[PDB]
Structure formats: structure tokens, C-alpha cells
PDB file of all heavy atoms in Angstrom:
ATOM      1  N   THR A 347     -21.430 183.703 296.912  1.00  0.00           N
ATOM      2  CA  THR A 347     -20.290 183.066 296.120  1.00  0.00           C
ATOM      3  C   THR A 347     -19.025 183.812 296.140  1.00  0.00           C
ATOM      4  O   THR A 347     -18.304 183.946 295.206  1.00  0.00           O
ATOM      5  CB  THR A 347     -20.685 182.834 294.629  1.00  0.00           C
ATOM      6  OG1 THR A 347     -20.726 184.169 293.918  1.00  0.00           O
ATOM      7  CG2 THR A 347     -22.185 182.389 294.488  1.00  0.00           C
ATOM      8  N   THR A 348     -18.733 184.409 297.385  1.00  0.00           N
ATOM      9  CA  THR A 348     -17.527 185.227 297.565  1.00  0.00           C
ATOM     10  C   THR A 348     -16.331 184.429 297.230  1.00  0.00           C
ATOM     11  O   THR A 348     -15.322 184.895 296.646  1.00  0.00           O
ATOM     12  CB  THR A 348     -17.473 185.847 298.957  1.00  0.00           C
ATOM     13  OG1 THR A 348     -17.658 184.801 299.964  1.00  0.00           O
ATOM     14  CG2 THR A 348     -18.613 186.992 299.118  1.00  0.00           C
ATOM     15  N   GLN A 349     -16.182 183.208 297.680  1.00  0.00           N
ATOM     16  CA  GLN A 349     -15.072 182.382 297.691  1.00  0.00           C
ATOM     17  C   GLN A 349     -15.482 180.970 297.378  1.00  0.00           C
ATOM     18  O   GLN A 349     -16.643 180.528 297.639  1.00  0.00           O
ATOM     19  CB  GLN A 349     -14.225 182.333 298.964  1.00  0.00           C
ATOM     20  CG  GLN A 349     -13.633 183.762 299.353  1.00  0.00           C
ATOM     21  CD  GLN A 349     -14.622 184.542 300.117  1.00  0.00           C
ATOM     22  OE1 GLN A 349     -15.674 184.135 300.622  1.00  0.00           O
ATOM     23  NE2 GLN A 349     -14.355 185.816 300.175  1.00  0.00           N
ATOM     24  N   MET A 350     -14.528 180.220 296.684  1.00  0.00           N
ATOM     25  CA  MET A 350     -14.780 178.857 296.314  1.00  0.00           C
ATOM     26  C   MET A 350     -13.423 178.032 296.411  1.00  0.00           C
ATOM     27  O   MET A 350     -12.494 178.543 296.279  1.00  0.00           O
ATOM     28  CB  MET A 350     -15.329 178.735 294.882  1.00  0.00           C
ATOM     29  CG  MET A 350     -14.142 178.641 293.733  1.00  0.00           C
ATOM     30  SD  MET A 350     -14.797 178.731 292.163  1.00  0.00           S
ATOM     31  CE  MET A 350     -13.330 178.832 291.266  1.00  0.00           C
ATOM     32  N   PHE A 351     -13.668 176.739 296.831  1.00  0.00           N
ATOM     33  CA  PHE A 351     -12.517 175.869 297.068  1.00  0.00           C
ATOM     34  C   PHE A 351     -12.035 175.390 295.663  1.00  0.00           C
ATOM     35  O   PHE A 351     -12.890 175.081 294.754  1.00  0.00           O
ATOM     36  CB  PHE A 351     -12.969 174.605 297.780  1.00  0.00           C
ATOM     37  CG  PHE A 351     -13.074 174.961 299.303  1.00  0.00           C
ATOM     38  CD1 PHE A 351     -14.249 175.073 299.987  1.00  0.00           C
ATOM     39  CD2 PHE A 351     -11.915 175.109 300.083  1.00  0.00           C
ATOM     40  CE1 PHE A 351     -14.389 175.243 301.334  1.00  0.00           C
ATOM     41  CE2 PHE A 351     -11.992 175.342 301.463  1.00  0.00           C
ATOM     42  CZ  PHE A 351     -13.225 175.374 302.014  1.00  0.00           C
ATOM     43  N   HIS A 352     -10.678 175.441 295.430  1.00  0.00           N
ATOM     44  CA  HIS A 352     -10.239 174.942 294.147  1.00  0.00           C
ATOM     45  C   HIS A 352      -8.794 174.511 294.425  1.00  0.00           C
ATOM     46  O   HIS A 352      -8.004 175.171 295.163  1.00  0.00           O
ATOM     47  CB  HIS A 352     -10.166 176.075 293.098  1.00  0.00           C
ATOM     48  CG  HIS A 352      -9.092 177.129 293.446  1.00  0.00           C
ATOM     49  ND1 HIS A 352      -7.888 177.162 292.999  1.00  0.00           N
ATOM     50  CD2 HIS A 352      -9.227 178.237 294.263  1.00  0.00           C
ATOM     51  CE1 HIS A 352      -7.271 178.255 293.481  1.00  0.00           C
ATOM     52  NE2 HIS A 352      -8.067 178.885 294.287  1.00  0.00           N
ATOM     53  N   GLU A 353      -8.476 173.364 293.856  1.00  0.00           N
ATOM     54  CA  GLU A 353      -7.042 172.728 293.854  1.00  0.00           C
ATOM     55  C   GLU A 353      -6.112 173.753 293.288  1.00  0.00           C
ATOM     56  O   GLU A 353      -6.339 174.308 292.264  1.00  0.00           O
ATOM     57  CB  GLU A 353      -7.049 171.406 293.281  1.00  0.00           C
ATOM     58  CG  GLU A 353      -5.679 170.743 293.260  1.00  0.00           C
ATOM     59  CD  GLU A 353      -5.260 170.413 294.711  1.00  0.00           C
ATOM     60  OE1 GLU A 353      -6.026 170.189 295.541  1.00  0.00           O
ATOM     61  OE2 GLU A 353      -4.020 170.298 294.838  1.00  0.00           O
ATOM     62  N   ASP A 354      -4.987 173.862 293.964  1.00  0.00           N
ATOM     63  CA  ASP A 354      -3.966 174.893 293.597  1.00  0.00           C
ATOM     64  C   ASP A 354      -2.878 173.958 292.864  1.00  0.00           C
ATOM     65  O   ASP A 354      -2.961 172.785 292.706  1.00  0.00           O
ATOM     66  CB  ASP A 354      -3.357 175.608 294.718  1.00  0.00           C
ATOM     67  CG  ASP A 354      -2.861 174.841 295.826  1.00  0.00           C
ATOM     68  OD1 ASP A 354      -2.849 173.539 295.675  1.00  0.00           O
ATOM     69  OD2 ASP A 354      -2.302 175.388 296.728  1.00  0.00           O
ATOM     70  N   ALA A 355      -1.736 174.620 292.411  1.00  0.00           N
ATOM     71  CA  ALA A 355      -0.641 173.895 291.793  1.00  0.00           C
ATOM     72  C   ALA A 355      -0.079 172.849 292.698  1.00  0.00           C
ATOM     73  O   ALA A 355       0.160 171.671 292.392  1.00  0.00           O
ATOM     74  CB  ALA A 355       0.428 174.861 291.294  1.00  0.00           C
ATOM     75  N   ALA A 356       0.305 173.248 293.974  1.00  0.00           N
ATOM     76  CA  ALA A 356       0.754 172.335 294.907  1.00  0.00           C
ATOM     77  C   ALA A 356      -0.024 172.467 296.316  1.00  0.00           C
ATOM     78  O   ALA A 356      -0.328 173.584 296.660  1.00  0.00           O
ATOM     79  CB  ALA A 356       2.238 172.607 295.182  1.00  0.00           C
ATOM     80  N   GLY A 357      -0.351 171.320 296.955  1.00  0.00           N
ATOM     81  CA  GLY A 357      -1.248 171.323 298.141  1.00  0.00           C
ATOM     82  C   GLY A 357      -2.661 171.296 297.772  1.00  0.00           C
ATOM     83  O   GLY A 357      -3.161 170.360 297.273  1.00  0.00           O
ATOM     84  N   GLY A 358      -3.386 172.312 298.140  1.00  0.00           N
ATOM     85  CA  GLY A 358      -4.780 172.473 297.779  1.00  0.00           C
ATOM     86  C   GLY A 358      -5.511 173.226 298.835  1.00  0.00           C
ATOM     87  O   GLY A 358      -4.962 173.677 299.800  1.00  0.00           O
ATOM     88  N   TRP A 359      -6.735 173.511 298.505  1.00  0.00           N
ATOM     89  CA  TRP A 359      -7.710 174.086 299.492  1.00  0.00           C
ATOM     90  C   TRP A 359      -7.140 175.478 299.787  1.00  0.00           C
ATOM     91  O   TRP A 359      -6.833 175.892 300.949  1.00  0.00           O
ATOM     92  CB  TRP A 359      -7.963 173.300 300.689  1.00  0.00           C
ATOM     93  CG  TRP A 359      -8.423 172.022 300.502  1.00  0.00           C
ATOM     94  CD1 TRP A 359      -7.808 170.972 299.689  1.00  0.00           C
ATOM     95  CD2 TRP A 359      -9.646 171.357 300.910  1.00  0.00           C
ATOM     96  NE1 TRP A 359      -8.562 169.780 299.789  1.00  0.00           N
ATOM     97  CE2 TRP A 359      -9.676 170.032 300.450  1.00  0.00           C
ATOM     98  CE3 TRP A 359     -10.653 171.818 301.661  1.00  0.00           C
ATOM     99  CZ2 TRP A 359     -10.730 169.138 300.791  1.00  0.00           C
ATOM    100  CZ3 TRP A 359     -11.679 171.022 302.021  1.00  0.00           C
ATOM    101  CH2 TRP A 359     -11.744 169.584 301.560  1.00  0.00           C
ATOM    102  N   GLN A 360      -7.131 176.376 298.792  1.00  0.00           N
ATOM    103  CA  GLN A 360      -6.673 177.749 298.871  1.00  0.00           C
ATOM    104  C   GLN A 360      -7.886 178.754 299.158  1.00  0.00           C
ATOM    105  O   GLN A 360      -7.589 179.732 299.922  1.00  0.00           O
ATOM    106  CB  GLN A 360      -5.920 178.192 297.709  1.00  0.00           C
ATOM    107  CG  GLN A 360      -4.450 177.947 297.631  1.00  0.00           C
ATOM    108  CD  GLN A 360      -3.725 178.199 298.940  1.00  0.00           C
ATOM    109  OE1 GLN A 360      -4.198 179.055 299.831  1.00  0.00           O
ATOM    110  NE2 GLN A 360      -2.518 177.630 299.119  1.00  0.00           N
ATOM    111  N   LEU A 361      -9.014 178.496 298.645  1.00  0.00           N
ATOM    112  CA  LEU A 361     -10.186 179.445 298.837  1.00  0.00           C
ATOM    113  C   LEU A 361      -9.872 180.833 298.459  1.00  0.00           C
ATOM    114  O   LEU A 361      -9.871 181.733 299.278  1.00  0.00           O
ATOM    115  CB  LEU A 361     -10.602 179.225 300.250  1.00  0.00           C
ATOM    116  CG  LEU A 361     -12.049 179.747 300.664  1.00  0.00           C
ATOM    117  CD1 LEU A 361     -12.764 178.897 301.624  1.00  0.00           C
ATOM    118  CD2 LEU A 361     -12.037 181.216 301.169  1.00  0.00           C
ATOM    119  N   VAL A 362      -9.629 181.022 297.203  1.00  0.00           N
ATOM    120  CA  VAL A 362      -9.336 182.320 296.589  1.00  0.00           C
ATOM    121  C   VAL A 362     -10.734 183.104 296.431  1.00  0.00           C
ATOM    122  O   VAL A 362     -11.710 182.485 296.299  1.00  0.00           O
ATOM    123  CB  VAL A 362      -8.587 182.219 295.242  1.00  0.00           C
ATOM    124  CG1 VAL A 362      -9.473 181.658 294.147  1.00  0.00           C
ATOM    125  CG2 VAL A 362      -8.003 183.598 294.901  1.00  0.00           C
ATOM    126  N   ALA A 363     -10.577 184.383 296.275  1.00  0.00           N
ATOM    127  CA  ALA A 363     -11.787 185.219 296.146  1.00  0.00           C
ATOM    128  C   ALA A 363     -12.271 185.114 294.671  1.00  0.00           C
ATOM    129  O   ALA A 363     -11.449 184.988 293.744  1.00  0.00           O
ATOM    130  CB  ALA A 363     -11.551 186.595 296.544  1.00  0.00           C
ATOM    131  N   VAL A 364     -13.577 185.307 294.542  1.00  0.00           N
ATOM    132  CA  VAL A 364     -14.182 185.240 293.268  1.00  0.00           C
ATOM    133  C   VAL A 364     -13.577 184.116 292.337  1.00  0.00           C
ATOM    134  O   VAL A 364     -14.283 183.373 291.556  1.00  0.00           O
ATOM    135  CB  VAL A 364     -14.186 186.650 292.477  1.00  0.00           C
ATOM    136  CG1 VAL A 364     -14.908 187.686 293.264  1.00  0.00           C
ATOM    137  CG2 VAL A 364     -12.699 187.091 292.199  1.00  0.00           C
ATOM    138  N   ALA A 375     -11.205 199.229 280.145  1.00  0.00           N
ATOM    139  CA  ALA A 375     -12.423 198.949 280.949  1.00  0.00           C
ATOM    140  C   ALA A 375     -13.055 200.260 281.572  1.00  0.00           C
ATOM    141  O   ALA A 375     -13.713 200.278 282.560  1.00  0.00           O
ATOM    142  CB  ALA A 375     -11.997 197.970 282.174  1.00  0.00           C
ATOM    143  N   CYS A 376     -12.697 201.397 280.767  1.00  0.00           N
ATOM    144  CA  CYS A 376     -13.295 202.613 281.214  1.00  0.00           C
ATOM    145  C   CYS A 376     -14.834 202.652 281.158  1.00  0.00           C
ATOM    146  O   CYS A 376     -15.432 203.229 281.957  1.00  0.00           O
ATOM    147  CB  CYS A 376     -12.598 203.759 280.410  1.00  0.00           C
ATOM    148  SG  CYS A 376     -12.868 203.561 278.602  1.00  0.00           S
ATOM    149  N   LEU A 377     -15.328 202.102 280.081  1.00  0.00           N
ATOM    150  CA  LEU A 377     -16.780 202.007 279.876  1.00  0.00           C
ATOM    151  C   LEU A 377     -17.417 201.192 280.953  1.00  0.00           C
ATOM    152  O   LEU A 377     -18.455 201.606 281.469  1.00  0.00           O
ATOM    153  CB  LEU A 377     -17.084 201.541 278.487  1.00  0.00           C
ATOM    154  CG  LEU A 377     -17.173 202.531 277.208  1.00  0.00           C
ATOM    155  CD1 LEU A 377     -18.204 203.544 277.470  1.00  0.00           C
ATOM    156  CD2 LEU A 377     -15.700 203.178 277.181  1.00  0.00           C
ATOM    157  N   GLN A 378     -16.793 200.155 281.332  1.00  0.00           N
ATOM    158  CA  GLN A 378     -17.424 199.275 282.368  1.00  0.00           C
ATOM    159  C   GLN A 378     -17.446 200.096 283.735  1.00  0.00           C
ATOM    160  O   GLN A 378     -18.528 200.018 284.362  1.00  0.00           O
ATOM    161  CB  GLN A 378     -16.550 197.982 282.540  1.00  0.00           C
ATOM    162  CG  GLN A 378     -16.647 197.034 281.376  1.00  0.00           C
ATOM    163  CD  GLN A 378     -15.784 195.846 281.486  1.00  0.00           C
ATOM    164  OE1 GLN A 378     -14.740 195.847 282.210  1.00  0.00           O
ATOM    165  NE2 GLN A 378     -16.121 194.755 280.838  1.00  0.00           N
ATOM    166  N   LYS A 379     -16.434 200.758 284.028  1.00  0.00           N
ATOM    167  CA  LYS A 379     -16.399 201.706 285.210  1.00  0.00           C
ATOM    168  C   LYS A 379     -17.476 202.844 285.149  1.00  0.00           C
ATOM    169  O   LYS A 379     -18.064 203.094 286.063  1.00  0.00           O
ATOM    170  CB  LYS A 379     -15.055 202.223 285.410  1.00  0.00           C
ATOM    171  CG  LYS A 379     -14.868 203.008 286.770  1.00  0.00           C
ATOM    172  CD  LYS A 379     -15.096 204.448 286.729  1.00  0.00           C
ATOM    173  CE  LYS A 379     -14.891 205.051 287.942  1.00  0.00           C
ATOM    174  NZ  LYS A 379     -15.256 206.582 287.895  1.00  0.00           N
ATOM    175  N   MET A 380     -17.668 203.341 283.900  1.00  0.00           N
ATOM    176  CA  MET A 380     -18.474 204.482 283.750  1.00  0.00           C
ATOM    177  C   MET A 380     -20.025 204.146 283.767  1.00  0.00           C
ATOM    178  O   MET A 380     -20.826 204.894 284.263  1.00  0.00           O
ATOM    179  CB  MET A 380     -18.128 205.252 282.564  1.00  0.00           C
ATOM    180  CG  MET A 380     -19.002 206.500 282.334  1.00  0.00           C
ATOM    181  SD  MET A 380     -18.936 207.053 280.538  1.00  0.00           S
ATOM    182  CE  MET A 380     -20.180 208.333 280.545  1.00  0.00           C
ATOM    183  N   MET A 381     -20.377 202.963 283.059  1.00  0.00           N
ATOM    184  CA  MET A 381     -21.882 202.738 282.786  1.00  0.00           C
ATOM    185  C   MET A 381     -22.543 202.327 284.096  1.00  0.00           C
ATOM    186  O   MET A 381     -23.766 202.256 283.945  1.00  0.00           O
ATOM    187  CB  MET A 381     -21.871 201.555 281.714  1.00  0.00           C
ATOM    188  CG  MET A 381     -21.287 201.954 280.333  1.00  0.00           C
ATOM    189  SD  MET A 381     -21.410 200.595 279.229  1.00  0.00           S
ATOM    190  CE  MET A 381     -23.107 200.413 278.915  1.00  0.00           C
ATOM    191  N   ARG A 382     -21.776 202.053 285.116  1.00  0.00           N
ATOM    192  CA  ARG A 382     -22.491 202.003 286.436  1.00  0.00           C
ATOM    193  C   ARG A 382     -22.589 203.334 287.042  1.00  0.00           C
ATOM    194  O   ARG A 382     -23.276 203.441 288.136  1.00  0.00           O
ATOM    195  CB  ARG A 382     -21.785 201.069 287.345  1.00  0.00           C
ATOM    196  CG  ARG A 382     -21.716 199.525 286.929  1.00  0.00           C
ATOM    197  CD  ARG A 382     -23.191 199.009 286.521  1.00  0.00           C
ATOM    198  NE  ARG A 382     -23.379 199.086 285.129  1.00  0.00           N
ATOM    199  CZ  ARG A 382     -22.810 198.123 284.236  1.00  0.00           C
ATOM    200  NH1 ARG A 382     -22.108 197.155 284.737  1.00  0.00           N
ATOM    201  NH2 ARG A 382     -23.146 198.238 282.982  1.00  0.00           N
ATOM    202  N   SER A 383     -22.054 204.438 286.521  1.00  0.00           N
ATOM    203  CA  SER A 383     -22.195 205.761 287.160  1.00  0.00           C
ATOM    204  C   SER A 383     -23.562 206.123 287.117  1.00  0.00           C
ATOM    205  O   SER A 383     -24.323 205.989 286.182  1.00  0.00           O
ATOM    206  CB  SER A 383     -21.183 206.642 286.411  1.00  0.00           C
ATOM    207  OG  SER A 383     -21.183 207.932 287.122  1.00  0.00           O
ATOM    208  N   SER A 384     -23.952 206.991 288.110  1.00  0.00           N
ATOM    209  CA  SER A 384     -25.385 207.622 288.193  1.00  0.00           C
ATOM    210  C   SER A 384     -25.385 208.648 287.141  1.00  0.00           C
ATOM    211  O   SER A 384     -26.518 209.055 286.618  1.00  0.00           O
ATOM    212  CB  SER A 384     -25.560 208.202 289.507  1.00  0.00           C
ATOM    213  OG  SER A 384     -26.977 208.219 289.790  1.00  0.00           O
ATOM    214  N   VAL A 385     -24.375 209.366 286.740  1.00  0.00           N
ATOM    215  CA  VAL A 385     -24.289 210.438 285.795  1.00  0.00           C
ATOM    216  C   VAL A 385     -24.819 209.853 284.453  1.00  0.00           C
ATOM    217  O   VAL A 385     -25.615 210.534 283.726  1.00  0.00           O
ATOM    218  CB  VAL A 385     -22.957 211.055 285.672  1.00  0.00           C
ATOM    219  CG1 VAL A 385     -22.916 211.865 284.399  1.00  0.00           C
ATOM    220  CG2 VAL A 385     -22.637 211.902 286.898  1.00  0.00           C
ATOM    221  N   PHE A 386     -24.492 208.688 284.007  1.00  0.00           N
ATOM    222  CA  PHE A 386     -24.992 208.145 282.826  1.00  0.00           C
ATOM    223  C   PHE A 386     -26.341 207.875 282.800  1.00  0.00           C
ATOM    224  O   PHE A 386     -27.197 208.075 281.946  1.00  0.00           O
ATOM    225  CB  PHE A 386     -24.242 206.786 282.519  1.00  0.00           C
ATOM    226  CG  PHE A 386     -24.512 206.108 281.208  1.00  0.00           C
ATOM    227  CD1 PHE A 386     -24.989 206.893 280.192  1.00  0.00           C
ATOM    228  CD2 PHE A 386     -24.311 204.803 280.948  1.00  0.00           C
ATOM    229  CE1 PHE A 386     -25.243 206.389 278.982  1.00  0.00           C
ATOM    230  CE2 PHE A 386     -24.468 204.266 279.685  1.00  0.00           C
ATOM    231  CZ  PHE A 386     -24.994 205.102 278.735  1.00  0.00           C
ATOM    232  N   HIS A 387     -26.957 207.388 284.057  1.00  0.00           N
ATOM    233  CA  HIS A 387     -28.423 207.232 284.181  1.00  0.00           C
ATOM    234  C   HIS A 387     -29.192 208.492 284.135  1.00  0.00           C
ATOM    235  O   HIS A 387     -30.129 208.562 283.492  1.00  0.00           O
ATOM    236  CB  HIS A 387     -28.762 206.551 285.516  1.00  0.00           C
ATOM    237  CG  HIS A 387     -28.628 205.032 285.628  1.00  0.00           C
ATOM    238  ND1 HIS A 387     -28.688 204.279 286.683  1.00  0.00           N
ATOM    239  CD2 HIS A 387     -28.455 204.178 284.579  1.00  0.00           C
ATOM    240  CE1 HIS A 387     -28.692 203.024 286.390  1.00  0.00           C
ATOM    241  NE2 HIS A 387     -28.459 202.993 285.070  1.00  0.00           N
ATOM    242  N   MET A 388     -28.627 209.658 284.716  1.00  0.00           N
ATOM    243  CA  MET A 388     -29.286 210.852 284.694  1.00  0.00           C
ATOM    244  C   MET A 388     -29.213 211.292 283.102  1.00  0.00           C
ATOM    245  O   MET A 388     -30.239 211.819 282.617  1.00  0.00           O
ATOM    246  CB  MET A 388     -28.507 211.934 285.563  1.00  0.00           C
ATOM    247  CG  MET A 388     -29.165 213.263 285.468  1.00  0.00           C
ATOM    248  SD  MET A 388     -28.290 214.442 286.562  1.00  0.00           S
ATOM    249  CE  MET A 388     -26.785 214.709 285.597  1.00  0.00           C
ATOM    250  N   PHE A 389     -28.135 211.118 282.427  1.00  0.00           N
ATOM    251  CA  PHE A 389     -28.107 211.545 281.069  1.00  0.00           C
ATOM    252  C   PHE A 389     -29.106 210.686 280.144  1.00  0.00           C
ATOM    253  O   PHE A 389     -29.733 211.390 279.286  1.00  0.00           O
ATOM    254  CB  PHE A 389     -26.592 211.387 280.542  1.00  0.00           C
ATOM    255  CG  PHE A 389     -26.477 211.703 279.136  1.00  0.00           C
ATOM    256  CD1 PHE A 389     -26.485 213.031 278.688  1.00  0.00           C
ATOM    257  CD2 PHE A 389     -26.438 210.729 278.104  1.00  0.00           C
ATOM    258  CE1 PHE A 389     -26.305 213.457 277.355  1.00  0.00           C
ATOM    259  CE2 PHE A 389     -26.201 211.177 276.754  1.00  0.00           C
ATOM    260  CZ  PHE A 389     -26.158 212.513 276.379  1.00  0.00           C
TER     261      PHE A 389
END
């Protein structure tokens, strides 16, 4: 689901792609702790 078709403001069919704690809680250091 990297990209999806969606109507834009004008024209269409653009196919666009698709917080410290959020960045840290995937860290391996947190898992070790």
C-alpha cells in the first residue's frame, strides 16, 4: 500500500505516497531496558 490513486484539486491521478516518543519507542535501547 505504498501509493494509492486519489483525485487531486485539479486534473487527477496523482498517486501520492502513503513525536520524540514515537521515534524512541522503536529503538532497540528501549527494548533492552
Side-chain angles (χ1 to χ4, degrees):
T347 76
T348 52
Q349 297 83 16
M350 89 191 170
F351 285 104
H352 70 94
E353 179 65 25
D354 61 356
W359 303 60
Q360 273 314 340
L361 195 141
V362 73
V364 298
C376 58
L377 277 294
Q378 293 176 335
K379 189 270 184 182
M380 182 205 172
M381 293 178 71
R382 294 315 99 75
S383 185
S384 199
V385 166
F386 190 20
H387 272 174
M388 182 179 72
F389 181 73

